[PDB]
Each structure stands twice: as structure tokens, then as C-alpha cells.
């Protein structure tokens, strides 16, 4: 009989249903203090709140010019710029009409910033993982020297040396924060496949940028979705409310599930990709060069 | 801005020279090419009380390359006696270096530096370094190779020569 301290309540954020932890069901169905079961509520007020009280124009320039003079609020450096999901718990009553889903790959979440003739990739922690040339506006030595920056939201997949583009928050020196996901996503898929070599590998563009497809969340779609092949291995599924602006930090307006959690949180087929997680010289070489 | 003459003495291989060139290039010399006599190197540090210029008199540790030894010391205003914590002999001779020095400069701030702390196999345990105590000198563990406590010997002397305990380095224009 230990009497052992409740170290499980040790927490630094206030983020509800953090994906930084397991689903709010595996540990406590009634949960812990910074976890929920009612997403429906906050979802509604949050977008009934989108009435620009925020200078996203000025902020995009700050990320691009690494300038933070400053002469509820937006993060003041390269960390915490991405818009993160909570687990999908309160499955919406209108899910198949208002929401969308992006199949996500196994990789690294990054904040991509292209300006002043270069491109950098940051983690959620604002830790620089890469500095390189790219074909995003502002991201290579051949560009406009004048507010032509681009800020993207990507997952970097190692095997494919591709940065899969998850969202766009700023393109050609114009911010898309104030725009709905519907619009943000359409834009990606109309402009990404319209840049010269953006989606291929060359000297000025060493890392291909591919946009991630989105799909509808109707029973039919979700089925066919889980039945699909992808150019990568599947990490999970992101669900976006079509109407959400792009807010740095955690929101309920996009939720996350792992493939196997899907056909048991809503109701769909379960066959393909949803499953819970003389001596002797013996080694033979792939390359096969000189002994 | 005002300047000072800093005499840097120690045995051969101590790291004196490697130490000073790190400071004016940020580069690290793996080679051991001995100093002949002395070589005066200007170092500038930018403090919150204006710039400060040290004239490092990087003298030679090797007996045959000694030159005009105590001759160099004359009119010094601060010193940096150094040894190699991977070589006990270098610490055992510090008293000889300090002796030659204070007969010329009978009251100047002096710092004692044990270099090579980055090396794993250390021979001069921190327990043994006690010379500075009864001579009222400052001591520091340093590494020219890793920049461990790199600027310490200089911050201390500056604090002493300017007469400001809260003097700081900033690296202004």
C-alpha cells in the first residue's frame, strides 16, 4: 500500500485532449483535468469568434524577416507557429458535410519559411532542422527581393526526401491565416502543381514539395479512403472543419485519429490498414563493390 | 578605450599560443609549433563600459627559445600563468614562472589557468591545484579546444583593471 504521488497531473500546458498523450480513454474515460469529451461546444464559439482582431500581415513579415521588435497573441519566434489538433472525440453530427480529412504520412512536422533567398524548416519547438534552396517564392537565390515570402506547414518524410505540404498560411508575401480551410486547401492544390520544379529534385530544389490530398468524410469516402494506396506509409488521419481559419497552437476544429481508431469511433470497414500497432560466414551485400 | 600589457607565461605545449589565436580568429591549431621569444597580439573585448584592448605578450615556454624573458615582463599590468592538466610537471613549475614574474611586476592581477580540461585522461586532479591560494591569484579551468570558460581569465582582469566588479562583456559594434 504505497500512497504514491499523483505525478500524472504534472502538466505545463492547458491544451485539451493533447495528442502529446494517448487518447483520453485509455487512461481515464472520465479523463484528467486538462482533457475533455465535449469538443462540440468550443468548436462553435471559436469560429463564431473569427473576426480578425489580429495583424497576420505584420506577423508573416516577422517570421520571414526574423524581426521581433514589437513596436490571445501570436508566438514571438519560430516555435509554436503550427496549428495542432486534439484527438477527435466528439465526432460531429455534420461530419460528412462540413469536415474533411487528410491522410498524413510518417515523418517530421515542420514550419517551412521561404524568404530573402532561402528556405528553412523548423520543428514545433522552433528548432532549425534544415537550411536549403527551394522553388517556393522567396526560397531560392533567383527570386523577387521584395516581400515574396512563403510560409508552409509540412510533414517531412525521410524515405522520399519529400516535404508533404499539409497547409499554406502565407504565399507570395500574402497571408492566408484569415482564410478558411476549404480555401487554403483548394489553393494548395491549384498552385503547388503549377510551380516549375517544386515537386521534383534538382540543384536549386533538392527537396520535392508534394501537396497532400484531402477527401470527404462520408461513410462511403472514409471506407474507400482506408482502402487506398499512398506514396508513403500512413501515420494517421487529420480531420479539418472546412470553415476554420488557421490559428497557431492547439484547436478542437481539427482532430486526429490513427487508422485503426477510425473504424471503431464512427463506423466503417476494417480490413486493409487499421490494425492496432567448415565455419560459417553469413552476411550478403546489396551494393557488391570490391571485396 | 584604454589598453593594457598582459604577459602570458607557462611551460612549452601548455596551449598559450593556441589559446590566444582562438581569441582572435575562433580557430583551433592542432599543431605544436613553439614560440620563439615572444609575439605581441592585440585582443579586443567589448564591454558595457567601452572597448578594452589587451596586448597579449605570448612568451615562449621552451628553455632554448626563451629570449629576453624577464625583459619582456617589464611594465606589465596583468598576467596569465598557464599549465597543462594532462602534464603534472607543468603545474610543478608554475611557482618558477610566478617567481620570475613578481620580481619584475610586484603587484599586478595574475590569473592561473589549467588548460586541456576537455581531455578525458586528466593527471592534475582539481584537488591538487592550490598554488594560487597563498599568492592571492585567481584560478580557472579552461579549454582552448572546447571554449570551456574561454573568456574567464579576461573578464576577471578587466574587472580588476577598470575597477568594476560588475563589468560585463557584450560584443557591441
Amino acid at each position: 500500500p504505497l500512497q504514491l504521488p499523483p505525478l500524472e497531473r504534472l502538466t505545463l500546458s492547458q491544451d485539451l485532449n493533447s495528442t502529446a498523450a494517448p487518447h483520453p480513454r485509455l487512461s481515464q474515460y472520465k479523463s484528467k483535468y486538462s482533457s475533455l469529451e465535449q469538443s462540440e461546444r468550443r468548436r462553435r464559439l471559436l469560429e463564431l469568434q473569427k473576426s480578425k482582431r489580429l495583424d497576420y500581415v505584420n506577423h508573416a513579415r516577422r517570421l520571414a524577416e526574423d524581426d521581433w521588435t514589437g513596436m490571445k497573441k501570436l508566438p514571438k519566434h519560430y516555435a509554436n507557429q503550427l496549428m495542432l489538433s486534439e484527438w477527435l472525440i466528439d465526432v460531429p453530427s455534420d461530419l460528412g458535410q462540413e469536415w474533411i480529412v487528410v491522410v498524413c504520412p510518417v515523418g517530421k512536422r515542420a514550419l517551412i519559411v521561404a524568404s530573402r533567398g532561402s528556405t528553412s524548416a523548423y520543428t514545433k519547438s522552433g528548432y532549425c532542422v534544415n537550411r536549403f534552396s527551394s522553388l517556393l517564392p522567396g526560397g531560392n537565390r533567383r527570386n523577387s527581393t521584395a516581400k515574396d515570402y512563403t510560409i508552409l506547414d509540412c510533414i517531412y518524410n525521410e524515405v522520399n526526401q519529400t516535404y508533404y505540404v499539409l497547409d499554406v498560411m502565407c504565399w507570395r508575401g500574402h497571408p492566408f491565416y484569415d482564410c478558411q480551410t476549404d480555401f487554403r486547401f483548394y489553393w494548395m492544390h491549384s498552385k503547388l502543381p503549377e510551380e516549375e520544379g517544386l515537386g521534383e529534385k534538382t540543384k536549386l530544389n533538392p527537396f520535392k514539395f508534394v501537396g497532400l490530398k484531402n477527401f470527404p468524410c462520408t461513410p462511403e469516402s472514409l471506407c474507400d479512403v482506408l482502402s487506398m494506396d499512398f506514396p508513403f506509409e500512413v501515420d494517421g488521419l487529420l480531420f479539418y472543419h472546412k470553415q476554420t481559419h488557421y490559428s497557431p497552437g492547439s484547436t478542437p476544429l481539427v482532430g486526429w485519429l490513427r487508422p485503426y481508431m477510425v473504424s471503431d469511433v464512427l463506423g466503417v470497414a476494417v480490413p486493409a490498414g487499421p490494425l492496432t500497432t567448415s565455419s560459417h560466414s553469413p552476411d550478403h551485400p546489396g551494393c557488391l563493390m570490391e571485396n | 578605450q584604454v589598453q593594457f600589457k598582459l604577459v602570458l607565461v607557462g611551460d612549452g605545449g601548455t596551449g598559450k599560443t593556441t589559446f590566444v589565436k582562438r581569441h582572435l580568429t575562433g580557430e583551433f591549431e592542432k599543431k605544436y609549433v613553439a614560440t620563439l621569444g615572444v609575439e605581441v597580439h592585440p585582443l579586443v573585448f567589448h564591454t558595457n563600459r567601452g572597448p578594452i584592448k589587451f596586448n597579449v605578450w605570448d612568451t615562449a615556454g621552451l628553455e632554448k627559445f626563451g629570449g629576453l624573458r624577464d625583459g619582456y615582463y617589464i611594465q606589465a599590468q596583468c598576467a596569465i600563468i598557464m599549465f597543462d592538466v594532462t602534464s603534472r610537471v607543468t603545474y610543478k613549475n608554475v611557482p618558477n614562472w610566478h617567481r620570475d614574474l613578481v620580481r619584475v611586476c610586484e603587484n599586478i592581477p595574475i590569473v592561473l589557468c589549467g588548460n586541456k580540461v576537455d581531455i578525458k585522461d586528466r593527471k592534475v586532479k582539481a584537488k591538487s591545484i592550490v598554488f594560487h591560494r597563498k599568492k592571492n591569484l585567481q584560478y580557472y579551468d579552461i579549454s582552448a579546444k572546447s571554449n570551456y570558460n574561454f573568456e574567464k581569465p579576461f573578464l576577471w582582469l578587466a574587472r580588476k583593471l577598470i575597477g568594476d566588479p560588475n563589468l560585463e562583456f557584450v560584443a557591441m559594434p
Binding site: 504514491l4 505525478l7 505545463l12 519547438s125 546489396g286 | 605581441v40 629570449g67
Partner: protein, 1038 residues
Amino acid sequence: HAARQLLDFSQKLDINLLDNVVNCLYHGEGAQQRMAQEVLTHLKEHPDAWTRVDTIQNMNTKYYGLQILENVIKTRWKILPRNQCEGIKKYVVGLIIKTSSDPTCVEKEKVYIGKLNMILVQILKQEWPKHWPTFISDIVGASRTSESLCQNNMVILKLLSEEVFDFSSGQITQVKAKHLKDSMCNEFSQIFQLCQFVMENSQNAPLVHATLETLLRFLNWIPLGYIFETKLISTLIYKFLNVPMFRNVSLKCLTEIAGVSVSQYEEQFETLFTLTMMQLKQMLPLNTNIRLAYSNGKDDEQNFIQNLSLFLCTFLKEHGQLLEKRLNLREALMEALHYMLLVSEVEETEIFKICLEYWNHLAAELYRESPFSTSASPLLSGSQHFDIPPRRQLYLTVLSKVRLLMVSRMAKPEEVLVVENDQGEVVREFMKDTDSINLYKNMRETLVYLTHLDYVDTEIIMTKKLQNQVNGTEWSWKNLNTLCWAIGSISGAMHEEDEKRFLVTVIKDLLGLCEQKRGKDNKAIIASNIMYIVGQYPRFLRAHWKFLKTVVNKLFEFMHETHDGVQDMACDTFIKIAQKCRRHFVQVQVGEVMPFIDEILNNINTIICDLQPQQVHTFYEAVGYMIGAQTDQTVQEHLIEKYMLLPNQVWDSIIQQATKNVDILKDPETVKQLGSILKTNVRACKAVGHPFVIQLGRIYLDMLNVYKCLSENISAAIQANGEMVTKQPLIRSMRTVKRETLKLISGWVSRSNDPQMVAENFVPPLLDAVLIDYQRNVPAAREPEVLSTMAIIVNKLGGHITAEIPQIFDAVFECTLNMINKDFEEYPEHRTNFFLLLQAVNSHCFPAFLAIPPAQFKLVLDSIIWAFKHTMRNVADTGLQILFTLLQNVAQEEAAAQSFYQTYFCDILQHIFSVVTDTSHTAGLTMHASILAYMFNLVEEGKISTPLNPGNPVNNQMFIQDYVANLLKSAFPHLQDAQVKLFVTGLFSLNQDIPAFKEHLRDFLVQIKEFAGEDTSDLFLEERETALRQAQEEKHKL
């Protein structure tokens, strides 16, 4: 202005030389030449000296001329005509007389004076006893007639003393020095008297202070009679100790006397302590904040305190056992102990380190009086429990304050230094033996001792502190760090059962403190301390699974935290815990069905996907220790496979691409991936050990193949564009793959446990891939760690790799040698490593040296002589160790060992003296002496064949004695036959006393620097002569 002067046969001026010296001290790149030419005005002689100090910036030129005069005196004094020596002493004495008196002696710097006096001492070392008999009487008489003359004469005595008793070893020969020591002692009365006369009567402050200064250097050696059996202690304390401008010198004297062993003067020390304490209580009131007095103090008030530290600590440490037994001193000891506490709060690290030196000694002296806690309860009769040891009794209240001290000022435990390696790769290094961390260790040790004598006091002190943080609002990050640092230090100092109650309460409060505190700034600091604490007490974690589990899980989520630092914290802690709690992760605990490791493995990516590259490496090393715990080889193999599943698929993807286009291994990103994949393999290997062969064996052949690829790339590039290319991102990225591959390979063979298996399998592919490749690279492109990798593996396999040595020595030996055999500077890392490799071979593979042709051997041995010629201390050293070890390996081989002596003995002997008599190789003294000793001792019996070749009537001993004789006589022709005979005798009679052998060598190193001349004979032959045989007999006695 060329300004050169090699022209003596011309009337050579003063205005000119006086112009270069101003350059040496004043201007610039021209001054290099000036300094460079005055170094050269030291060729012929000093016929200039006389006119240089005669006809005079000014003092600086006279100073320069003094150095020259100084040299001839230390050098040729003996062979000089007596009548001329006499001119010098009179010129020097006179020159001293004049400068002193002058009303402007404070301006004509003490520098010129200090030099003159110093030259006088120089002369005295030469003939003071025998040719200057009245010296001490004269100077005393003069000091009594003139104060000005007395003030300087007091400096003449301080110098003379420290030249005979402080710095004689090395500069003076042993017998000569003892004669001067004797001489300084047979006439110290008249001296000491004068000092007393001055202290009692002279009211001249500069004269008196300097007499206290000369006294401080006399306390090093003078007969104790003058100290304890005179009123010296009495004068110092009553007269000078209190007055400002004498407090520091006076206290230092006292400190020197307190440092003596008391066996005979117990009384004097006592009245020395109590008498001093009176004066301090009058100087420094006990109620004054010493920290501030230091904080707001000058150089003299600051040093007085440091000194106070020195006095107090030195005295207690050595005579504390005496302040105790005597019951009258009990109050002065409590005041002294009260002073140490006030001085302990000074904000200076060097003072605290002195104060701490004592506390660690008190706490240690009372830990062995009794390591136990005073039986915790009272007696049934209410009487005194009596369990209190007699001495600890006297310190109880003080010990409590010292515990508070450790807990209030605990040093940071770990020292982190961020700094990028020679690749531009940015990393965090952990310092290991820094003074700062020694501070932590000491602090810990002190509190850990105190916790053993009474942990309740420790646990209460820590509870007050911790509570004063919760509510008490003594809140600040600096303080909360110090406390938990302290809590962490005493880990293991309690009984396992109190540890439980302590931990649980400590951390519950901290957990509480985290909720009440607003701000992610405050919360992370706290959560980090909690994690630090829960990390130091694996004992607890090992006995409470659910807790261990809750802690790892909490760390996993912290691994997505984005606040500065946290992710570093969570990883360090996690590897720490896995290292010490590993068996619990791989074995099924009460409450679940499968071993935790499984969860961890089934989820690696979701745990680590927000971490930086290095953190990912640290995480992988963490889980490595877990898997290393699973001793079921079937289950362990399955675990390793999945463990390496992520790094492998990257690897396996890149490899397939190169089996189509080897130019993909030139792609900046694939190379960046290759390095990180390897770094991961290196960490995993470090923790899993030998079993890791399953993974290494799987990528081994392909890995060595990319190695050759990358190595041929770098080399090409360099050959085409010079060393400059190595300083560009891709060539550094490529170096990295090579370097980590070598770490991986040498890392595993280190921890391998099947010598033949490693030798038959993983060693042959090394040859073509790494060795012939090193050979085939251009010099500027060869990887020095190829040689140190090989060294490690020869160290490991020894006998099992002896047959490959030739083939290895082919690839690398001569080719490497050619890079390091033109000077002693270029390719340092190659010199170092090459010889580390040659050592491991000579050390664990010597039969190889016999197998190869007699001429490759000579080549081998030749390089060893090359090693100990090196001015790089490390290389020269390794060079001596190889030679010394080599000679003994030869000794075992009876048959073919007599040929070695025939061919090489005399030559090795010649080469050793070569560097013995070289002023730049003094750090090898010990080994020099060891090796020669071994060789001469060998001479006296074991060299069974004839070297001279004129039969047996020329026995080897006599030959060696006559070969070394001419060796030195031909090399040092100025030495008289007697100096050289002496030396050769010493080499055989001291052949069994290494320390004495050492001093012998050094004595020779002094004589060769002097022209002792066949003329005068100061060497004390007959005396020294027998003392050698008085060592010869020690060999065949006991």
C-alpha cells in the same frame, strides 16, 4: 634602420642600442626585428656590459645589460680569472650601494634594484662560503648603520633564502645545495637578531614591512627553535597583526607557523591560537557580515579575509585535536568555528573552496569516530542517552549550521557546455573532471557525511527549505535549483525505508508547487527539478513499478513539449532511468501482461517524432540498455530487430538506390541521413553490447562499401583542389560517415566476447575496405582515426590478430611514417595515433616483430626513437613506454634477445642520453631514468655476449662504462674528467634507486650548463663519491 650589431672590433655606441630597446617595448611589427636582434646581441660576450650600465628607455637598457652579465656569472664564473671575478663583485656591490641610497629609488623601479640584488645572489651562489666569508657579518653591520641599506639588504636575504631553499632543486646540484643550506644555517643567528632588532625598534614602515616579508620566506626552513622558543609569535600578534599595513603579511607568517607538526611545541601553538583570536575579535567583531565586508572591500581587506580563511582552516585542520582535549580552549574554538561560518558566506568561489576544505575534513573526522546516528530516543530513566561520541558532542550545533550551508549553496551537479565539433556539427558536451564539478562532489561528500551522523537534521533542514519555497515565499529559480540539487546529492545516504517517506513528501509538495504556480516559465523549472530528483533515486523507482511507469509515460509526453530546454531534460532523465532500471522494462511487472519495452517499441515514432536528431540518438541509447537486459537470446534477437526497424528502412532504401547509381552516395541529403543512421547504430551498440552483432552483421559488408565510396570521394576532391575542400559542408558530411563507421566498428569489437569469431569474420573485410583505402588516399585525405580504430582492436584481440599484423603494417605503416618523418609538427593526430597503434602492437602482438624481416624491425625500432625525440609531450611519452616495454618483451625471448643487445643496445643508450641532456624533454625525466636504470642493471649480468669484441678481458660493464664516458666527453668536452667519472659511477650504483637516479640525471643537467673548468673544484667528490656506494650496498643487503 637595420640596427644590427655583431661588430665588436668597432667602437659600438649606446644611443643606437638604446633605440631598439624602446622599440621592443613600444611600437609594432618592427619590434619583432628589434626583439629579434637583442636576442642576437648574446653571442660573443659582454664586453659591452660595463659601458652599457655606465653610459645609460634608460633603466630598461641597463636592465637588458644586466641579463647578459647575469648569464656569464651563472656560466663562466669559474673559468674567469679570479682578479676579474673580484672586479664584478665590487662593481655589483657598489652599483647596489649607489642606487639604494638615492632619494629617487622608488622611481628608478624596484625592477632595476631587484635585478641587481638578484645578480649579487647569483654571485653568492658561486663563492659565498669559501671566497666571501665575511658576507653575512658585513651585511649585518651595514644594516645596522644605515636603514636604507638595511631595507635593501633585507631583500638580499629574502632572495638568497628562496634561491637556496625554495628553487634550488634543478638550478643547483644536490651536494652544492646542501653545502649552501648548511652555510645558511650555521650563520642564521646574527641574521635573525637583526630582524628582531628591527621589529622592536625601527619605526620605518617600509623597512619593517619588508622585514616581515623576508621573515615569511625564512619560516620555510629556519630551525624551529627560532620560532617557538623565541618571542617571534609574541611580537607578530601584539605588534603587527592589528595595524592595517601589517595585517596581511603578519597573518601569513602565523599561517606558516601553524602549519608545522606540533609534537614538541603544544604549548606555543595553544597560546598562539588564543592570543590571535583575541586580536581578531578586536579587529573583526563576531557580529559583522563578512560577505558584505568582502563585497564592499578593497584588495587588502579582501585578501585579509582570504588569508583569514587560510589561517583558520590550516590551524583547525592540524591542531584541532588539541583545541579539544584541553578544556580551556573550548570557547576560542567555538569563536573560530563561528568565523569559518561567517567566512563561508563570502561570495567568492576560491574562499569557499578553502572553507569547504575544512568542513569536509571535520565531517570526515567525525564520521570515522562513529558512522552512526545517535540512538534516536531517550533512556527509560530520562537520563542522558550517552550514545553521543565524545568529539561530535563539541560540534553538534555547528554541524547543523554546516548542513544548512551545503543545502543553501549546493553547487550545480552536472556541467553542460554546448559546442560544435570539428564538422560544424552542433552538440552538447558533458564536462567530467572540472574544478566546478569537483566542487559539487565535495559539497556532496560533506553533506553525505553529515547525513550519516544525523539524517533527521538533514531531512528537517531540507523540509524547511522546501516549505519556505511552497508558502514561505523564499521563491526563486536559483534557490529551488539549489535545494533539489541538494536533495539529489544525499541519495543512498538514508535507510531505504526513510528514503521512501522522504521522497514521497518532498515531491508531493513540489507537485503541489507546480499547480499553484502560474506560467509555463515557472512550471518547467519545477517539473524539471521533480524529474531530476525522481532520477537520482532509482532505488525507489525499482521498488514501485506503477510509479516508474507513470514517470516514463510522463517523460514521453514531455518529449513533445516545446518550451526551451524541457525536451533536453526529459531525454537525459529517461536514459538515466533506463540505464538503472532496465530489468523492469524487459520483464513482466505485476499489473500488466506484456513487458513495457513492447509498448515502447510499438510506438517509437509517435514518441520521438518531435525530437531533434541528437535527442533521438539519446533516446535510442536509452532503449538500448533495456534490450541489453533481456538475456533470453531468442527474445533478445527479436527485440533488436524491431529496435532497429526505423533506422534500417532508411538505410535499406538508400542502399537499393546505390545498387543502381553509386552517385547517390554523393547526395548531400542521403549523406546527412547516413551519418545520423550510423550515430544511432553507435549509440544502440554502446548500450546493447556484443549481442548487437546481429544488427552489425547485417549491414556490415554494405557499410564498409559506402565507407570506401565516401573515402574515394573526399580523396579525389582533395587531390583535385587541395586541403581547402575539406572545409565545405559535403566533405565534412562525408568525413562524418567515415568517422562514425569507425566508431561503430571499434565500438562493437571493444565489447565483443568471441576473439576468434571477430578475427575470422569482421577483421578481414576491414583490410580491403579501410586499410588499403587509407593507403590509397592522398596524405591530406587519410583518416587518422583509421589508426586509432586499429589500435583499439589490436588491444582487444591481441593474439588472435598477430598473424595479420604484417598485412596491416603494410597498408599503413611506412606510408603513414613518410607523413611524420620530415619534422615534428605536421599531421599531429597521425603522430599520436600511429604510435598508439605501434604501442598496442608491441604490447599485445610482439611475436609479429620477430616474424618480419630484421630490416622492417629496424624500421619499427627507429620510429620509436623518433617518438621520444618529439616535443609534443604525449608522443614522446608513448615513445618511451614503447621502448621500455619493448626491452622487456625482448627479455622473455631468451635465444633471439642476445642479438638485439649486439645490434641495438649501445645505440638506444646513445639516443636516450640525446634527449636527456636536451632542455626540451624534461617531462620525460622519470621514464628516462627508469629506462637507463633498467639497461645498466641489465648490463651487470644479462648481456651474455661480447660487444667490444676483444674477448672476455673486456667485460661489458667496463665497456659500457667507457662507451658512455667518451659519449659524454665527446658531446660535452668542457666537462672535466672528474665530472664524467662521477656520472658513470652513479649510473651503475643507482641502478636500483630510481628517484636517486633521477636526481643524478638532473645534477648532470646542471653541470653541462656550466663551464666548471678543469680549474676550480667545487664538486664535493670524496663526499658524494661514497654516498653512491652507500646506495650500491643497499642493493645487496635487504
